[PDB]
Design a protein around this ligand. Structure first.
Ligand code: HEM
Length: 108
């Protein structure tokens, strides 16, 4: 065991496990509605919105330093406000790139 290595371990997973986003061949550039995000709270994926980017955060759960219980609060909703309350400086754009499923379009 080595303290502090969760993010290194996470990124190794993103380099060595295919389709963490769970897109199953769909491209990660799709325009997504919030109603769609809301319907990914259970099952094989959990979607959230951060600054307009939609991510499948289910694979990240056990790597989140703040805990699974905290990350679950983001399930099926826009979690930007929560993210900014706890750590607005975290580089989610880089850390979660391989979990990107698309972009939140308010008009969809
Ligand atoms: C969704 C993408 C998220 C990522 C990539 C992420 C990443 C991280 C990281 C790297 C840390 C360690 C502290 C640091 O490096 O600054 C952390 C801590 C923490 N996270 Fe997250 N986090 C996410 C979402 C959330 C959400 C939605 C919540 C709450 C609902 C949350 C709650 C916390 C808490 C409580 C801590 C410890 C205290 C704090 O830093 O405020 N995280 N997170």
């Amino acid at each position: 065991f080595e303290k502090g290595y969760s993010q290194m371990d996470w990124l190794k997973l993103t380099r060595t496990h295919p389709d963490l986003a769970g897109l199953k061949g769909q491209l990660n550039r799709r325009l997504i509605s919030l109603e769609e995000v809301k319907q990914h709270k259970t099952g094989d994926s959990i979607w959230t919105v951060l600054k307009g980017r939609v991510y499948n955060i289910a694979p990240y759960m056990k790597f989140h330093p703040g805990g699974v219980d905290m990350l679950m609060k983001a399930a099926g909703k826009d979690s930007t406000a929560l993210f900014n309350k706890y750590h607005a400086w975290v580089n989610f754009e880089f850390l979660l790139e391989k979990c990107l499923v698309g972009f939140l379009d308010p008009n969809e």
